[PDB]
Amino acid sequence: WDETELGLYKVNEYVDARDTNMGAWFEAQVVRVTRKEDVIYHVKYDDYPENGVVQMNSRDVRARARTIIKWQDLEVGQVVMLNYNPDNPKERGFWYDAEISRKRETRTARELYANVVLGDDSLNDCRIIFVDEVFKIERP
């Protein structure tokens, strides 16, 4: 609990924060920044006030996703943030980081596969439904 004015993100800044347990990214806001780069972010989630204030490692906080990578610009090997539902893969889910693994296209059909990063481990060759909603990851 050593308040710091250093660190990429500032108090009141609207960010993306990663839930440690699920590995998914949620819109959050920096409420406090402490130390022991390796600064600790204290965040509150925009749509989850009931989750309180959570201490985050600096790797679990980044600038909010804003740019959609269009289908034509998606490439095998790109690390992106996309929507996936691990329990119900055909349904809408949460925003996870993923490595694009396969990209297929016919005249009337498109197929996107990715290696999806979850709570701790990778889920290889997931079939991605939301091909037009793939986000570029904001990097400093």
Ligand X SMILES: CCN(CC)CCCNC(=O)Cn1nc(C)n2c(cc3sccc32)c1=O
Q: Which is nearer to ligand X, 21 or 108 (CB)?
A: 21
Interface pick for ligand X out of 9, 13, 16, 26 (rule CB under 6 A): 26
Interface pick for ligand X out of 32, 34, 45, 122 (rule CB under 6 A): 45
State the SS3 of 69-121.
CCHHHCCCCCEEEEEECCCCCCCCCEEEEEEEEEEEECCCCEEEEEEEECCCC
* Footprint of ligand X on 67-126 (CB under 6 A): 87
Provide the 8-state DSSP code for 128.
Answer: E
Query: Please, what is the minimum distance in Å from the beta carbon of residue 17 to ligand X?
Result: 8
Query: Please, what is the minimum distance in Å from the beta carbon of residue 65 to ligand X?
Result: 15
C-alpha closest to that of 94 among 120, 116, 66: 116
Q: Is 48 in the site for ligand X (CB under 6 A)?
A: yes
| Angle made by CA atoms 81, 72, 117, in degrees to the nearest 5 | 20
C-alpha closest to that of 9 among 53, 46, 45, 42: 42
Interface pick for ligand X out of 3, 51, 76, 92 (rule CB under 6 A): 51
Number of residues in contact with ligand X under rule CB under 6 A: 8
CB closest to ligand X, residue no: 19
For binding to ligand X (CB under 6 A), which residues are involved?
Answer: 19, 21-22, 26, 45, 48, 51, 87
